Each structure stands twice: as structure tokens, then as C-alpha cells.
Symmetry: C3
Subunit: 269 residues, 3 copies
């Protein structure tokens, strides 16, 4: 029984899209989620909507958000994020189905197993070699091709602490590190999802070229918002078309392996 | 009406320099500043002096309170003076660097006023940092340093480390490969918070050592830094003293208007 | 009078190895250490032996306790991932540098809230690991026939998660040779306390930078330690008496001066 958590996914909270709408405020051992969970079906697949933020990315309760989705029975989480492009070839409006990250966050709890919550006792060392679910990514990539969307099949997201944008020296340095796109929210979301044994993937939409590029207008909030206004529908279409493909793919082996990975990453006395 | 905040600026708190001296302890929504604000005029320009460390590790300095206080006092400009390590042979101890970029290696530091818990700063702020330091102020600093005959570098990238420890040699080498030219512990988040407050911020960095990336020279220590400052700190003081009246007689309204707009339109509201 | 703090050093707490065994629970201005201190002699040398994510270990209390007990030296043993083909699982690396990728960790005793440590301390880190101790480790490893690398840069990550593959590749480009979660701030605090610090790092995996091999997991690390941990124990046991009969007064005097003159006061 697949159930898809959706974070930041535009306006899928729509009666034309979401059937059986049920709003729900939950509490977790880690505090309150960002918003109420919105339950319902989209193309006959059970979904759980959760708005990520009004709140700086540093302060979003990622632990509570992922814990809530897990407690609701989510097997998958698909997030949508804006991002800056650090590569000429990734143009504003392009989608990037990211497959790696580089952590530049500093203030963020990255584990449920922190020694202070005995629903998560012990110490967890989760592998991150492949942080994003390969099968989900393959469906996203294939669906984007069918929809005719400008889409990159891989890429490394650098997540900065924020809320400030990067300096130019930082932007150039991230390029030398191998980062392709830049944002403020992928970490620790992706990490906590893996700890919970959830298949996690991300739809990243480039909105700007950060500030590395000597021939273009540097990033600002208005530049980001403008590009999203002109392009956000692409991400919504990809997500809507992808959901039923996920609903009719087989997952029991994938989910079993994720469960084992999560389980055997925990050390106990 | 220009008013210049001055942070770490040697001994400008001197009756021969500062006229109308008024000491002042303030409180902010972010807690107490590092020290009392010293108000007065230096060469006919309103100035506000603020010691950065009062005895306090760079990690613990209340940067938010410091910048908020200067903003609340009407400061349009902030000029900071900092010691730094050189990561380049050409930047010798005693040289001044008018930095134009930074690389953040800090970890513990709030970098925004708009943190969701202070309703003098409601919403979320994503301040642009493509050009973190005020270009016009930097141009005045550069031109003034040339006139004073000072060894001065017109640009450079400051890496700011968390501290209070110095860097390892592997860290020092890595920072060179990243494009950093000098290294310190205080530029971030000061520069960031000043931009959020719409203040024209510039920095005078004085190289005091070569960090530890030369295996064939004396590595940095507190005594090496103090020795170089003893032999050279007057250069930074002279630059700052000569610069203040040039800032006082430059036109700023367009520069300040653009900073204000940038700050204002970086804020997202519900 | 040398006294050697030993951290993570396998099972040296053995009556066949450790003589005047005295268990001891201490408190410090920084809170409780990770475990009780086990005092005793190993060969003829006074030693102090010393569930929680690496982020939460009370490194300040641990190092303060060892200092307060009179330790002149600290030798730590650590597992680590290898970021270089030539450093194979089971190899020992006598590390000589680090790169800090931690974020949550106090790295100083002189934090403005403890007046056993008043002022601000800016400790030099050009040479974070004691050269003489490292030379003894290297020479002893050669005598024991152990696979050993005479230098290496440890990147210490915050954890508790392992690194992503993009992170692993990036660390290679930065010059890191091995990767762990505990060297920083341990090495830093030891230098502040004027203690001669060295590290025995044992590679347990290749992290995840090979796209054609099994990535690191807890079970891969545990398996390699089961097959190899005795090497680190042997190195440490054989090294202790060499440290006990080396002269240290100049080395310790210079460390003491460095620590002392790194402190700024009002
Ligand atoms: N150069 C850059 N460096 C670092 N990060 C970025 C970003 C991404 N966000 C954006 C945000 C500031 S603007 C307000 C965000 C509105 C928004 C809405 N959604 C969900 C979404 C995503 C894609 C398509 C449709 C909806 N994601 N973001 C800020 O939190 C950072 C873009 N460019 C960057
Ligand atoms: N290699 C290096 N790595 C990282 N940082 C540095 C520094 C800069 N400071 C120095 C400080 C510890 S020593 C005490 C300095 C006292 C002082 C006094 N002033 C004011 C001043 C500054 C410049 C010129 C004139 C006066 N600024 N600092 C410590 O806070 C860091 C220099 N080299 C570095
Ligand atoms: N790729 C990698 N990236 C980052 N760190 C590592 C490590 C080091 N440890 C390992 C630990 C997770 S597994 C739990 C192992 C339990 C243990 C037991 N001992 C004692 C020991 C150590 C060295 C030599 C002999 C015994 N040390 N660790 C985790 O706490 C970090 C190894 N590979 C890494
Ligand atoms: Cl983001
Ligand atoms: Cl500094
Ligand atoms: Cl970093
Ligand atoms: Cl470790």
C-alpha cells in the first residue's frame, strides 16, 4: 500500500486534484510540524500534503515533519524545491532530479536518535552513499521526458544554512566542489527520511544563476518569485503525472531494503 | 545626514580625535551590545564607536545586538577594522586589504535579524550577498590609502573561521585552493547583518601573519599577531581618520536608497 | 613523570595488562566525562583509560579530567573511513593534520563561563599532533610489521550520518585521506591543556567514493574492527613503554608555553 508524502508541492491542495480532503494537526516527540497534514487521494493514490514553511529554512521543524509523515504510514516522500543553478547548462525553469547533496548547514539536527527521545533510542549512523530513491528518480526522469519538460537526470545540491544568499566567492567555490544547484532545505530532510526508511526524491527547479555568472542578474527573492511564477506549473504537472506511476510500481523489495538499512544503522548498548 | 559606526577601530576614543564624547549603554531586542556606544564627532562627522570584544571569543560576540544598536543610533555607514592572517605571499604582514568578498566557515552564528521571534523584524529575509561590501566606501578607502602611501590591496576574499582556535595547516592549504586571500574570525556575520539593516559596510583588514601555510616560516600565534599590530596598527588608524571626512563629504542618497530597497524587497511576508 | 591518557584504546582494561587498577568517577567544571577513569600501570608507565552520538560526547569534560589527573600525553585510537585507494581497511594511519567539518561542538575551555579558564584562548593548530609521539608510533608499527601510513589528514564530520558520495568526492579534492567523527575537538582541547596528543587511526571501510564497491555501513565497520582491532591494541601496548623512557621536558615545556601564551586577558 503506497502512501506519498508531498512537501512544498505547489497547490496540489485543490478540490479538482485532491479527493477526500481531510485536514489534521499532529504532535510529535520533536514538536509541531510546519503545518497541518492534508490527507486525500490524487489519481487514486493515498497522499499526505505538508507545507514546509514565513519561517527561515534554519527553523523549519524537519524532524517533526518527517516523523509525522512516517507516523501517517508514508512509504514515499516527494519534495519540490526552488534552487539556484551553478552550471550554464542548468537554465532557470529547468528541473533537476537531484541524486546527491553537499551539506553546508550548521544549525540543524540531522537525526531522530539524539539520546533524548526514547521512541528513537540508541545512535544511528545512516548511510548516505545514495541519498535519493533510485526508482522514484527513474519514474520522475521518464515522466519528465514524456511531458516534454526541460529536465536534468542528475545533479548535486549544495544546501546552505541561509537565510542569506551566497557570496560570489562562495558561489565559485561551490562550483569547484562539484555542486550543480543550490538551496536551503534538502538537508536534513533527505537524511531524516532515510533514517525513517522512507523512499525520498526531490524535484528541484532552477530559478536563477546564483551570482557566479558575470553576464546575468544576480539572485534575489524577486528574481526567484518571478521565475517560479513563469515556470512552477511544470513541477506541478511532473508531480501529478508521476504520482499514479508510483502507485502502480512494485515497491516491497525497495522498501524492505530501506527498512533493513535503517534498522541495522542503529547501535544499542 | 551621514553617521559612521566604527567597530574595532583602534584608539579613536581619544579627546584629541573625538569631540563631544558621550558614552552610552543601550539594549536591543537581541540583547546587550559588546560594549557601550561612544558618540561624538571626528573631523566634523558624527561617529559611533563600538568595541567588538568589549574579553569575549568571536563566537560569542552579540553581532545582532551590535549592528541593531548602530542602526538604531542612525548609522548610515559602518567601517570595521580587523586583523587577519595572509594566505598569499604578496599580502605581507602590515599590509592593508580592502576586502570585497567572504567565504563563511562559521557554524554557531545567527546571521539574520528576521528569526521569527522578534516582531521589529517580522518575516523571512533572504539578503543578496553577491557584493557584500559597499563599493563606494571601499573606493574611498582605496583612494585614501594610496594618498597616505600605504601598502594596500584593493580587493580580497576573507575566509571567516569559527575559532577561537587557529586553523590547521591542512585547513590553511584548503582555503588557498578555495580562493581565500586572508583569514579572520569576525567578518561573518557582521557584514551580513549590516546589509540586512541597509547600512553601507566596509572593512579594513590588516594582515598580521601568514597563518601556517608556509612550512618555512613562523606560524601564527597570539604573540605574533600582537607584535605585528604594535609595529603597524597606526596605519589602520590613519586610514580610518583620513577616510572619515571623505565619507562625510561624498553624496550617498542613491547608494543608501538602493541598499534600503534591496533590504526591504528581500523580506517575505505571509 | 609521564602519565598517558588513553581514549578509545580497545580493551586495555585487562588485569593481565593493567596493574594497580583503580576505577574512578570524576566531575569537572564542564560536566561528567563519558565514562569512569581507569587508573593503573601498563608496563611500568602510569596510564589513565577513558550509546552517545559523536556530536554529544563531552570532549571538554574528558580532556579536562585527564589533565586534572596529571596526564602529560594522550593517545587516542579511532576507526575511520579511507578516502585513498592505498589506505586499505585494516591499515593504521598515524594522522598529522585535520580538516574540521563539525558544526555543533565547543572547541575551547575558555568560553567566558568557567573561571578555571578565564580569558580567550587562540590555540595554534599548525601542528596539531605531537611529532615525537607520532615518530615513536611510526617506528613501533614498523617493528611490529604493521601496515601503517606515516601521515594523513583526517576530515572530522559532524555525524551521526555518514557522508554522501558528493561529500566523499569533495573531501578527496580537499586533501583529506581519512574520515571520522571524533578527532575535532579532542585534538584542539588537548593542545589547549598543554597535553602531547597523538592518534592511531584504523581504516574500516572506503566510505562511499567508489561507485563500484560496497559503501560504508555500521556492519561493514564492525566487521573490519572484528578482523583487525588487535593491531591497534598491539601498537599501543608496545608504544607505551617507549613513551615512558623518552625524554619529554623540552617538548612539554614548549607545549605549556604555547598554551599559556595563547590566552588573552583584559
Ligand atoms: N541562489 C540560491 N541560493 C540558495 N537558495 C536558492 C533558492 C531556494 N530557496 C528559495 C527561497 C527564497 S524565495 C521564496 C520561495 C518560494 C518557494 C516555493 N517553493 C515550492 C515550489 C518549488 C518549485 C516549484 C513550485 C513551488 N519553493 N520556494 C529560499 O528559502 C531559498 C533559489 N535560488 C537560490
Ligand atoms: N591566522 C589567523 N587566523 C584567524 N584569525 C586571525 C587573526 C585575527 N584575529 C586576531 C585575534 C587574536 S589576537 C588579538 C588581537 C587584538 C586585536 C586588536 N584589534 C583592533 C585592530 C585591528 C587591526 C588594526 C588595528 C587595530 N583587532 N584585534 C583573533 O580574534 C583573530 C589574525 N591572524 C589570524
Ligand atoms: N566512513 C566513515 N565516515 C565517518 N566516520 C567513520 C568511522 C568512525 N566511526 C565509526 C562509527 C560507526 S560504526 C560503530 C563502530 C564501533 C566502534 C568500536 N570502536 C573501537 C576501536 C576503534 C579503533 C580501533 C580498534 C577499536 N570504534 N568504533 C561512527 O561513530 C564513526 C568509520 N568509518 C567512517
Ligand atoms: Cl530551499
Ligand atoms: Cl577577527
Ligand atoms: Cl565547510
Ligand atoms: Cl569517529
Amino acid at each position: 500500500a503506497v502512501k506519498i508524502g508531498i512537501i512544498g508541492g505547489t497547490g496540489l491542495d485543490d478540490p479538482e486534484i485532491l479527493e477526500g480532503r481531510t485536514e489534521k494537526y499532529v504532535d510529535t516527540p520533536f514538536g509541531k510540524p510546519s503545518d497541518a497534514l492534508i490527507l486525500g487521494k490524487i489519481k487514486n493514490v493515498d497522499c499526505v500534503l505538508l507545507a514546509r514553511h514565513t519561517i527561515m529554512p534554519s527553523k523549519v521543524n524537519y524532524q517533526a515533519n518527517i516523523w509525522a509523515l512516517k507516523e501517517e504510514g508514508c512509504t514515499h516522500v516527494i519534495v519540490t524545491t526552488a534552487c539556484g543553478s551553478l552550471r550554464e547548462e542548468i537554465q532557470p525553469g529547468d528541473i533537476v532530479i537531484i541524486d546527491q547533496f553537499i551539506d553546508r548547514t550548521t544549525m540543524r539536527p540531522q537525526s531522530f536518535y539524539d539520546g533524548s527521545h526514547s521512541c528513537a533510542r540508541g545512535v544511528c549512523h545512516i548511510p548516505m552513499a545514495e541519498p535519493f530513491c533510485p526508482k522514484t528518480r527513474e519514474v520522475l526522469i521518464e515522466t519528465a521526458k514524456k511531458l516534454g519538460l526541460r529536465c536534468h537526470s542528475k545533479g548535486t545540491m549544495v544546501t546552505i544554512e541561509g537565510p542569506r544568499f551566497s557570496s560570489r566567492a562562495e558561489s565559485f567555490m561551490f562550483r569547484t566542489w562539484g555542486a550543480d544547484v543550490i538551496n536551503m532545505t534538502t538537508v536534513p530532510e533527505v537524511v531524516l527520511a532515510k533514517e525513517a526508511g522512507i523512499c525520498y526524491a526531490s524535484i528541484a527547479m532552477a530559478t536563477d544563476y546564483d551570482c557566479w555568472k558575470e553576464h546575468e542578474e544576480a539572485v534575489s527573492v524577486d528574481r526567484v518569485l518571478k521565475t517560479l511564477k513563469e515556470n512552477a506549473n511544470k513541477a506541478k504537472s511532473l508531480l501529478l503525472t508521476t504520482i499514479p506511476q508510483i502507485g502502480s510500481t512494485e515497491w516491497s523489495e525497495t522498501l524492505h531494503n530501506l527498512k533493513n538499512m535503517a534498522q541495522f544503522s542503529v547501535l544499542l548498548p
